[PDB]
């Protein structure tokens, strides 16, 4: 039956966009985390 399927496909898409938003946010954490390290790390070289 048509309406059921067509709406269901649309419903799936609403999940998907949230999943990829998580992955983006996760990636923002990776950049933040590496910045945090690299910034300090380069100073540690100076300290020693």
């Amino acid at each position: 039956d048509p309406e059921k399927v067509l709406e269901q496909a649309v419903i799936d898409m609403q999940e998907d966009l949230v999943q990829l938003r998580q992955a983006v946010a996760r990636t923002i954490a990776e950049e933040k985390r590496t910045e945090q390290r690299l910034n300090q790390d380069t100073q540690e070289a100076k300290k020693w």
Binding site: V5, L6, Q8, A9, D12, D16, L20, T27, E30
Partner: protein, 48 residues
């Protein structure tokens, strides 16, 4: 000498495994983006 060496060995063994684990986990997360994008909407919604 055995201790000082062992301590350095331990220290880096741990740290390398941790940052490897982190980059491995991040790498599979990036691959999971490509896989979930490969979960394309070009699907049986068309059939509905």
């Amino acid at each position: 000498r055995n201790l000082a060496a062992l301590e350095a060995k331990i220290s880096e063994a741990k740290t390398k495994k941790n940052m490897l684990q982190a980059r491995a986990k991040a790498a599979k997360a990036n691959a999971e983006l490509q896989q979930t994008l490969g979960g394309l909407g070009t699907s049986s919604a068309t059939s509905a």
